[PDB]
Amino acid sequence: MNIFEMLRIDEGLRLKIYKDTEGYYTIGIGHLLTKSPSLNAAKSELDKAIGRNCNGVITKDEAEKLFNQDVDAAVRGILRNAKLKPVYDSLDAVRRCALINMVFQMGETGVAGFTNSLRMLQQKRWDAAAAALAKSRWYNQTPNRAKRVITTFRTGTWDAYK
Ligand SMILES: [Cl-]
Numbered sequence: 001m002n003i004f005e006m007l008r009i010d011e012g013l014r015l016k017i018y019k020d021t022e023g024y025y026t027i028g029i030g031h032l033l034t035k036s037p038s039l040n041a042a043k044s045e046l047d048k049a050i051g052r053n054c055n056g057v058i059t060k061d062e063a064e065k066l067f068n069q070d071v072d073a074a075v076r077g078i079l080r081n082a083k084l085k086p087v088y089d090s091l092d093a094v095r096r097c098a099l100i101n102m103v104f105q106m107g108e109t110g111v112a113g114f115t116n117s118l119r120m121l122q123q124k125r126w127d128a129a130a131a132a133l134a135k136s137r138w139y140n141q142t143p144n145r146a147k148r149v150i151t152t153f154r155t156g157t158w159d160a161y162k
């Protein structure tokens with residue numbers, strides 16, 4: 001199991017613009033297009049991102065390319081962020097994927113707001129970290145995915161995904 005397979009399980013793959021759980025226009029493997037209500041705005045963003053007139057539809061390859069970009073961008077933002085970097089450095093490999101999962105989903109700023117959870121993980125207090133992470137809108141809105149990520153942090157294994 002690797003980060004790409006983990007996220008493909010959590011986000012799915014769709015080749016036509018769809019609305020995410022929050023109602024925003026997305027495509028491929030959890031690639032957010034725009035927060036805007038406009039489908040046209042979405043289509044414009046999409047074309048800008050692919051480099052061609054897509055008319056709301058992309059290929060598998062195109063979807064994987066966006067995914068390669070987003071995962072890379074998530075990892076590099078972690079490494080650049082003063083709050084995230086030290087947590088990431090302190091973690092084992094599996095747990096590292098779990099942080100990358102959160103960042104891909106909610107962005108760097110979002111994850112960086114989880115002050116106490118961050119501290120608990122840096123301290124390797126797994127159980128405490130799992131409990132704090134659960135007290136969030138994130139957990140309440142997408143409980144199945146959140147539980148899977150939380151279990152990855154708690155155990156340090158890929159059990160939740162197997
Ligand atoms: Cl927290």
Ligand SMILES: [Cl-]
Nearest residue numbers: 134135136137
């Ligand atoms: Cl709550």
Ligand SMILES: [Cl-]
Nearest residue numbers: 142143144145
């Ligand atoms: Cl969910």
